[PDB]
Amino acid sequence: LGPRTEIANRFQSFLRTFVDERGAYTYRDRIRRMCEQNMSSFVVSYTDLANKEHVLAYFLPEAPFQMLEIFDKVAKDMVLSIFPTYERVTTEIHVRISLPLIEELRTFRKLHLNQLVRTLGVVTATTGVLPQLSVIKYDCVKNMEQTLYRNYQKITLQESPGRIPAGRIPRSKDVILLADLCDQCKPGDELEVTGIYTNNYDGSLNTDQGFPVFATVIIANHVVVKDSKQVDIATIQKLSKDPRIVERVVASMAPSIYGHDYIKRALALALFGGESKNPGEKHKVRGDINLLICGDPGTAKSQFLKYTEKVAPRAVFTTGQGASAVGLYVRRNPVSREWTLEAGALVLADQGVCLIDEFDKMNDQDRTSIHEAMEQQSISISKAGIVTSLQARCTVIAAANPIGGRYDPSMTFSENVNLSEPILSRFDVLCVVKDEFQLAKFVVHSHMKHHEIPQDLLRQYIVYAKENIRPKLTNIDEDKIAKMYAQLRQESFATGSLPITVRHIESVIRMSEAHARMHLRENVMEADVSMAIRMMLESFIEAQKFSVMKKMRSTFQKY
Amino acid sequence: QAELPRGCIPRAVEIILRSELVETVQAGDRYDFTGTLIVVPDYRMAFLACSVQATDLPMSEVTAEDMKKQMTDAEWHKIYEMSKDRNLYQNLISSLFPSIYGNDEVKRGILLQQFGGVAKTTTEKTSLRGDINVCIVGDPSTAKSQFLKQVSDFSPRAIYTSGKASSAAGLTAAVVRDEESFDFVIEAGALMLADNGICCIDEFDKMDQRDQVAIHEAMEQQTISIARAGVRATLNARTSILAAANPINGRYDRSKSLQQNIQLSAPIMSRFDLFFILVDECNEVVDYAIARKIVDLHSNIEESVERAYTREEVLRYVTFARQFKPVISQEAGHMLVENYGHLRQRDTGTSWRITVRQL
Amino acid sequence: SNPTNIRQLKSDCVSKLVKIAGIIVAASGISAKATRMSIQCLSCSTVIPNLYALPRKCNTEQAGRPKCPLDPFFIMPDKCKCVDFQTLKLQELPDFVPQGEIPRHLQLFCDRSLCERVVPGNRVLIQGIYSIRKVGKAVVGVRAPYMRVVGITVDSEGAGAISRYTSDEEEHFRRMAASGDIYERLSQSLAPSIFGSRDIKKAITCMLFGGSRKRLPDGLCRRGDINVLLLGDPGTAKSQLLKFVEKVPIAVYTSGKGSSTDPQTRNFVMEGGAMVLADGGVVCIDEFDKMREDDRVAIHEAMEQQTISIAKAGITTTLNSRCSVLAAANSIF
DNA sequence: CGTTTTATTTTTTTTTTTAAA
């Protein structure tokens, strides 16, 4: 085709001649960047393409695939001509596009076949990643070996659950990916795609039943991730390591209302820990947090936990029973074809959290898994083919509801909400929300929205608090606690005064250190002690009988 | 349902349609199909069609005038007499259920349920919402289901159906396991066919301990995903609901808490913000209004109260109010704090569980 | 005989030899395979390329005319050869992102003498081949993973595996027992680094050695197995102490519902009961009453006698053991 | 006067039924 003459010229005159945006165009450098990362996905933007010559939108759709041939030949002939060095290794090529116009599901129809397309989707279950065949050879007698391959995985997409046409059925479509654009699909994400429409090579072409069995299939030239949940430093290193940050961060901690300044301190600590320090010869010891509050119907024990979902390095959410399953039964019966059986999510986001309302509602056989993660850093599948475990370097948080009503007074908390004790033995952190009698003007102002920490970094500091500074020490003055053990075992003797232990301060040990995770201290003094005691001093006093002063004189001196 | 036989059921029949006819169909409507019955070349039967005939151009009480759109609410000239003269409310208390009598609070309260709610302009961080959770109880032999049945005639998506029959799989679809079409079509349902509509239901009483899994979603989450062998997506509840439980021997004996007078589940009475009961009394002069109304109930001449506001002019004026979007910098809106405060002075006595969900 | 992983090897790496390392999972038995045999019809050793089905030539043929098309080929295995199989298996590391993702794996294939070599819970290095089993051009062509073996090299992980595959240490042993100071000396050893049971830890001296399963001429096989108890509140290091005891002969340790009463080749497997790791091994566990009562008959059969039996299907395991338990507690007061 | 025939398994939701201090 003599036409094929001019096109590559218009490429060749374009990849190594063009300049845009005040020099050193990417095409001079993207290839080598690609070449230095051995990537084979050199990208084009159609907007720049039409900025030069929009003729490549109108001789394209009679066959865009021959257009892509006429792309790859040019690219190849640039790389090995300029990097004949490259002529060893992989030595094949294709390119990418990102016509950056969003168009939508449920519109591709009779007239959208095999033509210039641009669409999105949302991802769900599909298969593994596997290979195929490529070439025309088999004969010599007068071949199933040495016959080059190309990986493969199946897709499944879904559409926005936001922009839905109001009770129109959520829909589904079968689509493809290929080897180089593979191993990036996972459940529950969206991805914007160049897209292109066809059917099977032959989808049941025949006199048949009262309707043909025809399908419709797409693949991507380009995929650009829309979600990207992991990856301007003058703030953090100067502002976010003080103990004034428990105003600064507390200024921006829970931007909903002023209320309950305790948990601002709490959540100022709550995402801020995790430690290995496995001892010698004994076992691995402890690096978990374990928290709950008993709320009320009308409190905020539902709207309790939202803001941290987006921010954390790891987060895993589950509302409790009502639709909680036991999958949270593995005979070591690996998931055979079209047979699927499931297992526990605790290891996913190991060193992440379980975000929970209706914690107290769930099923005990699920609680078995949920418990010993926090106790012996392992849990036990129970007398199936395997008696396997599930690794637990992680944290536990929840938003439960009370027992038998709304809220119990300083009367003990087992009867304020009906968990178990030997599950609570491994529990760490507490706070409580009752209310008797500014906000109304706030609430109506907030109902009139006609329409400090930076928001677009604040993770990577907490990464640094979960990354950087990690001292330990001997007994600074915590031998004091032989009193807090012995005296308050015995002065606060018989009302509600068991729950004082070394695990009652192993809980402290996890976060007294963490003051330096916040501060990058590299050491620990009684400064961080007294603030930790200000948390124990304040959380604990509610969990004991309405003899309430038992904490106050006894510990407010340590405030 | 305009055609309904005895014995027999609305049996099922199956059909295809063209590109411009395609995906232009919604929940329960009355269209005019084409009678081109056609064979299966397997046989068995089928059929086919090519033509359908299912508010800028105006509703009833009009003739063409001007508005924001062509005639969307154009007939202000006749509405407005019935818009502002606030005794018109009494038409909406009197001229709407003239064949019926009960309490006069429901018959002055339901209307805003029928009518749009808040629909404000605020956050992405969280949704704000318009409609409300709702109930009605009493004991039977008090005319407590006439009204629900009437709504199916009165208002759109007034889907009067029983709750006694429904399953927890009443709401969505459940399963397919063979190549029906694609071996996974579990996106059929019962609720979200509320096209700007409500689903009020009878017999919420002996119902199971799973329905709440949807009602928990009612006024915060409004989203629809299933833990089956299919997929999960979500959808938008457009809908409110009605409550239809009842008591054992009926009377809510005024010695024990009204919660305990039935003593049903935990969060249900947090979310439902008004209950609006009518309970029985025995003072028969009460009762002698009734039958002396039904003196014209069979006696076919003007056998009700004289009206003053037709159904169709009512139904048209419903819309005019839903495109105004008030703006509240109300100083009295700032003195709701005093209103709610003197309220809680009354709440202080008689010591229910009260909060801002009631605010 | 430089290692690699599983998420790195694809269409390019086919018909090629590789070094990687993983962790064994389970695998099948030892069935069959040959190299050649022959047929009555021609009686030639059926030469094979790889470890087709005799096309149109019959060779019940040269009898005059009378013909014999379409395979009078009764395969005659009495002339045959014979090989082994196992179909082996691996899991990837615990270091290469199975956390936000899923841990993937593949299947393997062996030939002759390298079965009866490997069992689950082990750690391997290998060389194989990336090869295939399917054919093509499956909405287009999805196909075959596996590998075979050539020459694995397994690990010797440190100090644990006196399990499957000196006299200076006897001199170590005995010159301490020459001292008659072990009864009460090792009453501060079984908790070698922390406090508890101190003056009463002497009572372990009888149990780990146990008594003696002194059979008789008469019926009984006496209770050589004999049981001991602990019970109390938390905080005493009672969680971590028995945690160590698994480190200090052989057992398993958690409490309640967490041990405790396939889609392939149509055989019902049953991996068994509780004498698995405890028949010489003994255990120490909490939560007796904190456990379902359906799986609390067995304890009464296990323990006082090892009166074992089976009734799911119709056959009777007559099992027993030289095993025992300890109990731990957080019961009442 | 010649050259070719033939296999499917596990999970759902309903309506049945069945379990413990």
Ligand SMILES: Nc1ncnc2c1ncn2[C@@H]1O[C@H](COP(=O)(O)OP(=O)(O)OP(=O)(O)O)[C@@H](O)[C@H]1O
């Ligand atoms: N104020 C009233 N207005 C009209 N009808 C009334 C009034 N009070 C009583 N009645 C009559 O009393 C009868 C009560 O029996 P009814 O058929 O209502 O049972 P029901 O309320 O439908 O029971 P349920 O609501 O539990 O299904 C009604 O048919 C109604 O006509």
Ligand SMILES: Nc1ncnc2c1ncn2[C@@H]1O[C@H](COP(=O)(O)OP(=O)(O)O)[C@@H](O)[C@H]1O
């Ligand atoms: N201390 C508070 N701070 C902010 N909002 C509050 C507070 N107390 C109550 N609320 C109000 O409570 C509402 C939520 O009630 P909700 O949590 O849904 O009850 P439930 O948990 O039983 O579902 C919110 O819209 C919020 O405005």
Ligand SMILES: Nc1ncnc2c1ncn2[C@@H]1O[C@H](COP(=O)(O)OP(=O)(O)O)[C@@H](O)[C@H]1O
């Ligand atoms: N005498 C002690 N020596 C060492 N550690 C102890 C002692 N008493 C209590 N502990 C602590 O108790 C913890 C174990 O408590 P545990 O037995 O789990 O409580 P529970 O039995 O309620 O679960 C250990 O981490 C240990 O640090």
